Amino acid sequence: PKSQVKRQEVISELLVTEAAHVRMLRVLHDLFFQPMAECLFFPLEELQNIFPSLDELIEVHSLFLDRLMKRRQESIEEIGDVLLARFDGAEGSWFQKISSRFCSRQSFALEQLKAKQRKDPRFCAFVQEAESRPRCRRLQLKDMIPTEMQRLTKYPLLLQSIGQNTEEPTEREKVELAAECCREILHHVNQAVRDMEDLLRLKDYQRRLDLSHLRQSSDPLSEFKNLDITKKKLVHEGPLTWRVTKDKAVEVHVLLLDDLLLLLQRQDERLLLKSHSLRPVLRLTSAMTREVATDHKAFYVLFTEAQIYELVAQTVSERKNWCALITETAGSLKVP
C-alpha cells in the first residue's frame, strides 16, 4: 500500500484482459474461421493465409491464461517467473513466431475478406449473419482481426507498471526483463508486418512489370537484365508527372526503393520501364533533389552526365515530401 493496490490491480487487469482476448480469438475461430472452412468459401491453403495460425495462436494465449490462473488460484507475490515462461527463452521465441505470423497478414486478411464480400453475396450474407450472433459482442469481423496486434501493444504497458510497482528487487528484475521481452516482440512483429505488407506489394508489381525494354537497349541497363524487386525495401510510392521536355509530359507511378529509383509507366494492368527521351531506372547512390522556381509543384532529381529528371507532384506539400524522402534515402547509402 499504495504500491501494492496498483500492483494487484494491474496484475488483475492483465489476467482479465488476457481472458477476454482468448475469448475473442475463440469467437473469431468458431463463428468465422471454422464455418468458412466448412462452407469452403476459400480453398483452405488460402484460408490459412487469412488466419495464419489461428489454432495455435489461441493456444499460446490460452497457455498464458492458464499459468496466470494457476498462479492466482494458488494465493500475489511473484509473477515474474510466469511472465518469463511466456515471453522469454524458447516459449518466448514461439509466441513471437506464432503471433507475428498471424499479425503480418492482417492487411492481407482484411482485403481478402472485403473483396469476397463485395464480390460474392453468398459470402457477404454469411458474414452478416455471423456478425449478428451474440458472441460477437457487437464487434465486426473487421474489428476482430486486428485485435491480436492491439493485444501485443498492450503487454509492455501492463508489464511496465507491474514492474515499477514491484517492491522486492529480484522479482522486479524478472518482471522488468519480461516487459523488455514484450517490447522486443512488439518491435519485431511491427517489422515483420511491414516486411509482409511491402513483400506482397512488391511481388504484385514484379509480375506486372513489363521488362522487355531493358533486354533491348544497347545502353550499357544491362545491370537490370533480369531486374528483381521482390526482396528490396519500398520506401515510398506515388503518382507524379515526368516532364521529359517542357512540351511532352509522361504519366508515371514512382517507387522509391532502398537503393534504386523507379519511374513506372502504367499501361492497363501492366507497368513499363521505357528508356524514352533518359532512363526509367536509376541508382540512388548519386541522387540529389532541387526546387523549381518557375513551378512550386515541380522538382528536379539529378544523377551526379546529367541526367536531369523534372518531376511534378499535384500538391506543393507532396513534392516537398518527395525530395525530403529521396535525399534522405539517397544519403543513407554508403560509398565503397
Curated annotation (Swiss-Prot):
Cysteine pairings via disulfide bonds: none
Tissues in which the protein is found: Ubiquitously expressed.
Describe PTMs of this protein: Phosphorylated by PKCA. Angiotensin-2 induced Tyr-309 phosphorylation is mediated by JAK2.
Residue ranges constituting the DH domain according to the UniProt record: 6-192
> Could you tell me the superkingdom of the organism this chain comes from?
Eukaryota
PH domain location is 233-331
Compartments it resides in? Cytoplasm; Membrane
- Modification sites for Phosphotyrosine: 309
The written remark on domains in the entry is: The RGSL domain, also known as rgRGS domain, is necessary but not sufficient for GAP activity. The DH domain is involved in interaction with CCPG1.
Subunit (UniProt): Interacts with RHOA, GNA12 and GNA13. Homooligomerizes through the coiled coil region. May interact with CCPG1. Interacts with CTNNAL1.
Briefly, what is this protein's role?
Seems to play a role in the regulation of RhoA GTPase by guanine nucleotide-binding alpha-12 (GNA12) and alpha-13 (GNA13) subunits. Acts as a GTPase-activating protein (GAP) for GNA12 and GNA13, and as guanine nucleotide exchange factor (GEF) for RhoA GTPase. Activated G alpha 13/GNA13 stimulates the RhoGEF activity through interaction with the RGS-like domain. This GEF activity is inhibited by binding to activated GNA12. Mediates angiotensin-2-induced RhoA activation.
Which disease annotation does the entry carry?
Immunodeficiency 62: An autosomal recessive, primary immunologic disorder characterized by recurrent severe respiratory tract infections and bronchiectasis, due to antibody deficiency. Affected individuals have an abnormal B cell immunophenotype, with low levels of circulating memory B cells.
Q: Know the name of this protein?
A: Rho guanine nucleotide exchange factor 1
Q: Which organism is it from?
A: Homo sapiens
Q: Tell which residues of the whole protein are contained here.
A: 411 to 765 of 912
